[PDB]
Amino acid sequence: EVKFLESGGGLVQPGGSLKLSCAASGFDFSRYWMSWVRQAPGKGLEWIGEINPDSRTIYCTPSLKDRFIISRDNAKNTLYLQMSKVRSEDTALYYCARIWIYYGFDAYVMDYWGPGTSVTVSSAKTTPPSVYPLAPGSAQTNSMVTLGCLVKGYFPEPVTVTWNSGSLSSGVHTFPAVLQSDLYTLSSSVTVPSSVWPSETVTCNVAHPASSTKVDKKIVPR
Amino acid sequence: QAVVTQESALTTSPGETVTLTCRSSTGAVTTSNYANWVQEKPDHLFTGLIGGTNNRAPGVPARFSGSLIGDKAALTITGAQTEDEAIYFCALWYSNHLVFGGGTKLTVLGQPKSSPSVTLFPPSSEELETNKATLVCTITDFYPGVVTVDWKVDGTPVTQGMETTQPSKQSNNKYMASSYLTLTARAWERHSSYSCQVTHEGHTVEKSLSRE
Numbered sequence: 108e109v110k111f112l113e114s115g116g117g118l119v120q121p122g123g124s125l126k127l128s129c130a131a132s133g134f135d136f137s138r139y140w141m142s143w144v145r146q147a148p149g150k151g152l153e154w155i156g157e158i159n160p161d162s163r164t165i166y167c168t169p170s171l172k173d174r175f176i177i178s179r180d181n182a183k184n185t186l187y188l189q190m191s192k193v194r195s196e197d198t199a200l201y202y203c204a205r206i207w208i209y210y211g212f213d214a215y216v217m218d219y220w221g222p223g224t225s226v227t228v229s230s231a232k233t234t235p236p237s238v239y240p241l242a243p244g245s246a247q248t249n250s251m252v253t254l255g256c257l258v259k260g261y262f263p264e265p266v267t268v269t270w271n272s273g274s275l276s277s278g279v280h281t282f283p284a285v286l287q288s289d290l291y292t293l294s295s296s297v298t299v300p301s302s303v304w305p306s307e308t309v310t311c312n313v314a315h316p317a318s319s320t321k322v323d324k325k326i327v328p329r
Numbered sequence: 330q331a332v333v334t335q336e337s338a339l340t341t342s343p344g345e346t347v348t349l350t351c352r353s354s355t356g357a358v359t360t361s362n363y364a365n366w367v368q369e370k371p372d373h374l375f376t377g378l379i380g381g382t383n384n385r386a387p388g389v390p391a392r393f394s395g396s397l398i399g400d401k402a403a404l405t406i407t408g409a410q411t412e413d414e415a416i417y418f419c420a421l422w423y424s425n426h427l428v429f430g431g432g433t434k435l436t437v438l439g440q441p442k443s444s445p446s447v448t449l450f451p452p453s454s455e456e457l458e459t460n461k462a463t464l465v466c467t468i469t470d471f472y473p474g475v476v477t478v479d480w481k482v483d484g485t486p487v488t489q490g491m492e493t494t495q496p497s498k499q500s501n502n503k504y505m506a507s508s509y510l511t512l513t514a515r516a517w518e519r520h521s522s523y524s525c526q527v528t529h530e531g532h533t534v535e536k537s538l539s540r541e
């Protein structure tokens with residue numbers, strides 16, 4: 108089985124450095140060109156570069172040669188990417204991919220891809236979220252009502268959100284985080300019968316493991 | 330400064346034939362661009378499908394094929410299957426670097442079309458006391474998983490300070506997304522009518538509120 112596993116990602120300060128590794132199994136790595144590709148959150152693929160088997164030839168996207176060095180060690184079956192002078196725009200998932208060259212030596216495909224390793228570049232300090240209620244505006248009736256919980260400005264990911272301490276689970280939706288002003292924000296919603304709220308209490312519980320915090324916010328009518 | 334352009338999103342049904350295309354800002358795509366097609370399936374699983382314009386990768390199903398069509402490179406799925414719902418990236422070679430297109434989300438209808446449930450929330454009083462205001466528009470239970478979101482404040486579309494998540498899968502296999510409008514508290518106080526508008530499959534769902 109052709110298989111890849113990347114490592115070396117994580118959180119790095121702006122202006123910091125790191126070295127990513129892509130270990131290749133299941134084929135003779137010394138016979139193949141290898142490439143690096145990345146994907147910033149919510150966005151598409153961006154090629155970084157590629158390197159031939161004996162490292163005599165490296166192609167790279169011009170904007171990134173200032174920061175990034177591609178190398179390989181065929182004895183270790185490993186591809187590397189040295190990242191220096193890193194910047195916010197380097198936050199991304201980083202993938203290695205094998206180059207398959209077809210018969211005739213004039214066609215190729217990027218056939219097998221690693222699962223990716225995540226790099227986050229940020230100077231943010233650990234920051235617990237500000238949790239706010241989402242309640243309908245002061246109010247026409249339907250048989251269900253949708254309530255929510257704004258989990259604003261925390262760092263790092265993740266947070267964990269529950270409703271009534273885990274007791275409300277059906278029809279809970281917790282949305283992906285967005286990045287604003289160097290901090291993460293997400294929301295969670297839950298739908299309950301109109302006859303149930305506000306007669307009965309509905310509360311969101313938000314934990315931020317990195318801050319060791321866990322807070323409750325009752326959803327109150329406006 | 331080569332740019333590669335793809336359709337943002339296409340929809341087909343199982344058994345139909347669909348073609349995705351790939352355009353170059355330098356002119357016509359040629360065999361010397363060695364067009365590649367890469368499939369992205371959920372949990373960031375990438376797989377090469379076509380290389381060198383028209384070669385299937387080893388092991389790729391015969392229903393996938395590549396060609397040039399006019400100015401453009403093309404990926405054709407002849408007899409689409411529901412498992413082919415995915416994002417497809419094309420990549421073109423320009424002598425010494427590779428450029429990916431922006432990707433095409435391909436929906437292969439595997440469940441009924443479902444219009445979004447949209448909820449708009451005003452800023453909380455507690456947030457306003459920090460001199461900030463965030464409006465939240467939640468969007469659930471839609472399929473296909475493609476929406477466009479716009480915000481208006483007293484008839485002015487918002488071009489700064491709005492942010493929308495990419496659609497993500499629900500446990501019931503429909504899609505969800507959220508959108509945010511960031512304001513100062515003074516801005517909140519100085520305007521009256523607020524609207525989040527969600528367009529899905531050519532129809533707009535609008536939710537609005539008035540301050541105070």
Ligand SMILES: CN1CC[C@]23c4c5ccc(O)c4O[C@H]2[C@@H](O)C=C[C@H]3[C@H]1C5
Nearest residue numbers: 140157206208212213214215363422427
């Ligand atoms: C993206 N990248 C893949 C590997 C390589 C290549 C290409 C096309 C046809 C080939 O046969 C081929 O092999 C190498 C190299 O010789 C020249 C360019 C590079 C480029 C495109």
